[PDB]
Design a protein around this ligand. Sequence first.
Ligand SMILES: CCCCCCCCCCCCO[C@@H]1O[C@H](CO)[C@@H](O[C@H]2O[C@H](CO)[C@@H](O)[C@H](O)[C@H]2O)[C@H](O)[C@H]1O
Ligand SMILES: COCCOCCOCCOc1ccc(C(C)(C)CC(C)(C)C)cc1
Ligand SMILES: COCCOCCOCCOc1ccc(C(C)(C)CC(C)(C)C)cc1
Ligand SMILES: COCCOCCOCCOc1ccc(C(C)(C)CC(C)(C)C)cc1
Ligand SMILES: COCCOCCOCCOc1ccc(C(C)(C)CC(C)(C)C)cc1
Ligand SMILES: COCCOCCOCCOc1ccc(C(C)(C)CC(C)(C)C)cc1
Ligand SMILES: COCCOCCOCCOc1ccc(C(C)(C)CC(C)(C)C)cc1
Lengths: 56, 96, 103, 69, 63, 56, 114, 97, 55
Amino acid sequence: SLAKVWMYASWIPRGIPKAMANELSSAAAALAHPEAIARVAQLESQGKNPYRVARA
Amino acid sequence: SSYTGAALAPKSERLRLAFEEKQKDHQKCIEEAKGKGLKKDELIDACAWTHRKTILALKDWFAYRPPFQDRRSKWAEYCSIRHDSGSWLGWSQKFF
Amino acid sequence: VYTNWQSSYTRLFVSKPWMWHPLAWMTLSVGIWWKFGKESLCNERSFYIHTHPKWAPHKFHTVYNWSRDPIKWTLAEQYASIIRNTNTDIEAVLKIKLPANAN
Amino acid sequence: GELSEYVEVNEKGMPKPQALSLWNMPYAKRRALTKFARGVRWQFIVLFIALYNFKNRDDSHLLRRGAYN
Amino acid sequence: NLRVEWEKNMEIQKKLHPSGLWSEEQAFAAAEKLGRPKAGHPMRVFEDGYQQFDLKPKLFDPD
Amino acid sequence: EFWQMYLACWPYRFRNTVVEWETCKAKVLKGSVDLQDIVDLLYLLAWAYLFWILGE
Amino acid sequence: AAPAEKPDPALDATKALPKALEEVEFFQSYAVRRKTGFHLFNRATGSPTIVGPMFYNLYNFVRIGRVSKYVCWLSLPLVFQRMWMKNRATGMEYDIDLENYAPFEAKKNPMHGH
Amino acid sequence: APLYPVLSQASLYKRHFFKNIKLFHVVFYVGAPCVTFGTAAWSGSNRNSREAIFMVIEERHGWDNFKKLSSHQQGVIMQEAAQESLLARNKGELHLP
Amino acid sequence: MNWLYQMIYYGVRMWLVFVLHSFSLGSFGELITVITDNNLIFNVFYIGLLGLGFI
Ligand SMILES: CCCCCCCCCCCCO[C@@H]1O[C@H](CO)[C@@H](O[C@H]2O[C@H](CO)[C@@H](O)[C@H](O)[C@H]2O)[C@H](O)[C@H]1O
Ligand SMILES: COCCOCCOCCOc1ccc(C(C)(C)CC(C)(C)C)cc1
Ligand SMILES: COCCOCCOCCOc1ccc(C(C)(C)CC(C)(C)C)cc1
Ligand SMILES: COCCOCCOCCOc1ccc(C(C)(C)CC(C)(C)C)cc1
Ligand SMILES: COCCOCCOCCOc1ccc(C(C)(C)CC(C)(C)C)cc1
Ligand SMILES: COCCOCCOCCOc1ccc(C(C)(C)CC(C)(C)C)cc1
Ligand SMILES: COCCOCCOCCOc1ccc(C(C)(C)CC(C)(C)C)cc1
């Protein structure tokens, strides 16, 4: 189908940053204090962008 | 073409001609340093290279004694072998 | 209680061939250099092989600069120092005419 | 096994054959074969090579001097 | 693409040396232009102790 | 505190990239695109043009 | 000749692979992570990557270091230095005369030797 | 009544700092600065780019003239040489023999 | 004499192993860098900062 064609066409573009993205996500889960991660989850449950909250 | 064979000139003549060639190469440096107007101390720093080359050629010439004729050397010539007629033991004379 | 471990290194060395091994190793390596590597590499007559790209690739971190010739000018400075310390005449060698072993 | 310069012996004091038996032939034939053999193999080969090179040695250095004129 | 196209166009009309090769004519012309010394052959294969380990040495011959 | 929240916010950002992309696709195809969406997309395109120049 | 030595269990090989697997299990035990804050970009098929789900373990060990976690990153700006200088050099304008007179690492230059 | 030179508690406390090292405590702690500021990453990159830089300079401009110029123009020409060498237009952009 | 032969052989073997493997690995790395420097869409930490290094 056309969806498979789009998948096999966009595989190589979509996957170039996936390594660094997963690296940053995992390094955050590991190095960051779990209270900060819990606060992030809370704020996202409250419909807020916790990155903007942190910057503010 | 090419061939693997004997040296053209003898060892004595070879060393003599080498010393003469280095003599020329040193004389040219000296004449050029004189043309440039250098003193003795500057001439030394200029042509010490060719001086050392001439001295090494002279050392090579002085170190090599051409062989003396005797019955053993003549028999080795007939046998066409490299032979020292000043050794009673050969390779072991180095240790005795 | 007496021990050569704490009171005599000589008797300890004598009583242990595994202490002789490094010394023999050292002596053999130095003898190898003396017999093979000394005259073929380190002598002034045999030092330009370090400029060879096949037998001494990048001994100067690059191909050897022949226009510059650092070896020549270094050694020439040193020979000049020798000449000044000895007060030898540069032009005395040119007055020589060697004979030939005629016949 | 099959060590160098080594041979086993049987109850009769005789050498046991490792690969090949040569003790069927009479004593005269063995003495004929072994009277001229030695405990040396490669030196004779080197000597024959040296004798070949001596027969075929070069004498140009004598020609240059005139020993063949 | 711009760089390699310019470089190829100059290599074709001999205004620039070929890729990886030192060309004699262009170098001599550039030396004449810049007023610099010409590229000589400063090496000395017959120097003492250069081709001693060479199985097939080079023979000295005054041409 | 900002460093900890900056780290902890990376998983949220990488997770919501795809979410925001899918919602934008749905709003563009469906046509249910409003004023605030238009303003956010214009801000997006401005920053994208800046980063395009920067990449050049 | 016929010593009749009993088997020595210390000469057997029945502990090396278990010990290596114990070390690997200790390594992988530090990969345990909580559900909160979890995100991993899978492949386009939806299947996981290889290096992706084994970054948390590595960085959980980086967390435990003392000196390397604050030093081994200082060689990383050098990567961006190369990334920038390479692009600077891809299109750098140069003099034709100097390139023809002094080409860098070009073959058959007699001043080099060949 | 110990007949030997009894060592104080604090001296042992200090010597324990020196003799209670483990292998990894040396290996990694000394390898991190070494790997970062060593022949691989920083010192190697610096000292090996310098060789190419000054080769390019002495071939193109000259070392004496380069010495006569200002530190700014020196750095400019050095950066140009570093770019010329990193590019390696003659090696097909490949740092191999 | 075979002890000497084996010593020389295994010394040369270790030398060749280290040299050739280092050279081959660096060569593949440099070819990859040439592929990616000319295509900056790929000049990214595509495997990962620690993943490739750890492997
Ligand atoms: C069973 C019967 C068999 C019949 C066949 C017999 C053939 C025997 C072999 C004869 C071959 C001789 O081979 C030939 O020998 C001569 C010397 O003799 C060698 O010649 C050598 O000696 C001469 C003599 O001074 C030197 O000057 C010369 O420089 C040197 O080469 C030749 O290089 C070689 O070609
Ligand atoms: C710099 O900012 C410039 C902003 O320009 C905005 C241009 O106006 C775009 C508004 O377009 C729409 C689109 C849809 C709608 C609908 C029909 C969906 C009605 C709405 C928003 C009340 C739900 C209204 C306006
Ligand atoms: C994903 O797309 C995001 C927006 O992309 C829009 C691309 O627009 C093309 C712009 O083209 C250019 C290119 C160069 C320039 C110059 C060099 C004139 C800009 C300058 C002078 C600021 C460097 C300007 C516009
Ligand atoms: C396929 O490969 C299998 C080869 O197996 C190798 C087995 O070697 C394992 C070595 O690793 C270690 C390291 C340290 C240790 C201990 C924990 C015993 C170290 C100690 C003494 C400091 C506690 C045990 C095993
Ligand atoms: C000294 O010996 C120790 C060397 O051990 C190194 C082991 O390296 C492999 C670890 O990498 C992984 C692999 C898989 C995984 C997890 C991805 C086990 C799979 C999971 C979490 C999805 C179950 C984590 C880390
Ligand atoms: C990165 O670290 C570099 C500098 O570190 C310096 C650490 O110095 C700690 C010294 O440790 C002590 C502390 C106290 C003492 C005394 C003798 C004062 C303790 C005492 C009085 C209880 C015996 C001795 C050594
Ligand atoms: C596949 O294996 C990859 C892991 O190899 C890593 C290499 O590490 C170099 C040395 O690392 C150490 C450090 C300490 C040790 C111990 C802890 C066993 C040292 C000891 C014996 C002093 C306690 C062992 C190895």
